[model samples]
Target chain A: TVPKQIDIRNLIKELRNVEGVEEVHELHVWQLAGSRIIATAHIKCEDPTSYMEVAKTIKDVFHNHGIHATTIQPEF
Target chain B: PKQIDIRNLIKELRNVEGVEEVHELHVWQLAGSRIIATAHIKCEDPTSYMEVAKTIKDVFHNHGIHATTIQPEF
Candidate 1:
């Protein structure tokens, strides 16, 4: 479970460690809707399947904080 | 092996409002069992882009078709 004080510093650090994860940034615009405070990351896949795996990792981490990832856009 | 109903997909896509045009990139696969279907949709504006995307996603989901990706290029 994520702590009440959400510290993204560690989360960002962990995301950087994952392969195929070129860059990660928190999306502030997605707050327009009442959904979970969502984020978007610019992912470049060496192996497309590997990029999918990275998305799963991100979802797992955020789920602990009661947040769900809506989408992960991949750039070629 | 189940065959994808291409005719139905085309019909459903055409029904979307403000969807001016659609071009399918690749739809058939030989080696592996999966069809990667892409469409180049033309719309009047960005707002309509979201509408086209959402409608396609719903149609695919309801028809038991897996969507690899539904992106917009305007």
Candidate 2:
């Protein structure tokens, strides 16, 4: 069963280690139904174009853990 | 799976204190357990920014939504 609450701290830790991700902030995750989870993260990085790369990485990491959707906002 | 009732959600947000107008509201399903919500609101310029934000956050929390971002427009 999916946990009731997302481990936001752990996600933040992993996000910080991803390449091109200078800083991660305002990361929030919550359960909508069953095992599905949704998340939105605000990130500060080196380049705006890297937003896609960062978003992909985040999706990759979270998808495996049952996160179905994510929105990444890059702060330039 | 239980789906989000966007109409109801919007109605609830509109009822919150300091929320004069809800310009936009968006919700997305990430997975079975995840739902993302974002909103843009218009309120009195004199309203405390933090207060409005906190109020919105509380509203989201009360609705079993933990992930929400709110932008306040004066």
Candidate 3:
């Protein structure tokens, strides 16, 4: 069962709090058929490790809240 | 597969202190579970481009992401 719905607004706040991260911008959150939440963020981090940490945190938090979250790797 | 979220990936790239710019041009998903990505990247210093590229490659590969082709524009 999906974890009880939590406050996404608060989750965004927590996500921005990650260290060594900058240019935190939320591009969009797509709700597919009201059953999925796909959120996209644009950020800048000097340390690759820290960036991964942020991604990991997002997945962990969302999964804990009963949401299936997948992180996309930007190509450049 | 430990794939880093796209948002954080973009964020971390922009925040690199010495990086001047990063442009992701193409992202093609292949049939063999491979992805072809292209980017025109710029840096504050020419010498650091190699380092930046290496770092980016390492980060992506670690997350099970591979670059079909990655080269400098100039």
Candidate 4:
């Protein structure tokens, strides 16, 4: 069983390690099925142009942690 | 598979009180119809963040959203 409190330093480190991901904020996650977590976050790009590849890469990163990440940028 | 009019959803928030504009709207569903949303809310004035969240909370609820991860920006 998991405690009510959680730690996210690992998550932050994992996300920022990707190229062009300068900021990661407001990251939250909810319990899913056993060993699965669904994450909701606001990860800022160094610029708008990097959101695509940057977003994709972080999603992969989350998977290694048994987490599912939802990330998308403004399409305009 | 399902459908949601996100284009229309963003437009609706523009008219809500205390919300000047918004950005980075990300929404998804879990466990069937359990909708969760994350967005940046831009407000015209400074006030309680939870208050801003409360106004839009109702707006989101009407649209069938169950929870909000709204970060207010002034």
Candidate 5:
């Protein structure tokens, strides 16, 4: 069974509201060794300057959500 | 469930016309071989999205994956 009890769809929706983030997808959150948390996603931005902002904001968001490790890719 | 060749899948997706890029590709099998897949595809034109999505799905199907979520970004 997939990881449950967490509504990641809502989280991604919140990410969509961020300024300059055009879209998001290919995201996943998985727990490893029954403890470690990992995440991956693609953040699409129309502006290059917002890349820094979007990247850091996404990392921070996952950090706030207790994701210990993250791999974020941006397509602009 | 063991996953099919995701490299091939990505390659097919990359080769599609009007698709500029493909990234954040992830696929895996867990909980007894129920493979899962997700990926982000980028292109400038909105009109091509549906066709691209359909092709991606067909590519996956051709490669043995029946279900997937190919996110599109403009």
Candidate 6:
């Protein structure tokens, strides 16, 4: 379970701490149905496999933060 | 018309601090030594916007890459 309101700054900080995430260039967040917030981010990784791991890590983090829909772009 | 060393450009971008991923690079060859390029950048969302932009622009300038548009993503 997660709260309706979220702090974007904190979210960014958490994202940066995720392993295999070399860089997080942009993060956009907006309100969705009811109290949900949708987010999308662009990330950089060393290779294809690394990107996969990074994306999964991002999604897991966002889900825990109450964001159900997440989009992660991996750059190599 | 301008000439661009794509290999060198990619290497430089990869070396840039806080730049994790570099993709969607588009180049347009123009008259004289002029070239237009646009690329997407991936880095930490918590990074300062001004600092990141300046870093990217500096890289472009150092490599003589004119008219660059960067799409930053976190």
User: Candidate 2, residues B24-57: lDDT per residue as tens digits?
Assistant: 5776666566765787676665234445667777
Q: lDDT of all predictions, in order shown?
A: 0.54, 0.67, 0.53, 0.64, 0.69, 0.68
Interface RMSD of each: 9.1, 7.4, 9.3, 9.1, 6.9, 8.8
* Backbone clashes in model 5, listed as residue pairs: B1-B33
Q: Which of the CAPRI classes, incorrect, acceptable, medium or high, describes model 5? A: incorrect
The sequence of per-residue lDDT tens digits that candidate 2 reaches over residues A11-60 is 67888887888987777666654767766677776754565456678768
Which is the winner by DockQ between candidate 4 and candidate 6? Answer: 4
Interface RMSD of 5: 6.9
Q: Which ranges in model 3 have alpha carbons more than 4 Å from their true place? A: A1-76, B71-74
Worst 10 residues of 1 chain B by lDDT: B24-33
TM-score evaluated only on chain B, model 4 = 0.73
Better by lDDT, candidate 3 or 2: 2
Clashes of each: 0, 13, 8, 0, 1, 11
Question: Which model scores highest in TM-score?
Answer: 5
Candidate 1 lDDT over A1-76, as tens digits, reads 3324444676567666777776653322123235445444444545555654566776676665445643444443
The better-scoring model by DockQ among 1 and 5 is: 5
TM-score of chain B of 6: 0.75
TM-score of chain A taken by itself, candidate 1? 0.59
Q: Which ten-residue region of model 2 chain A has the weakest summed lDDT?
A: A47-56
Q: What TM-score does each of the candidates earn? A: 0.42, 0.49, 0.41, 0.49, 0.52, 0.47
DockQ comparisons of all candidates to the true complex: 0.04, 0.06, 0.05, 0.09, 0.07, 0.04
iRMSD, model 6, in Å:
8.8
lDDT of 3 by residue, A1-68 (tens): 44346577766666566565565543334344457664444455555545545656755655654456
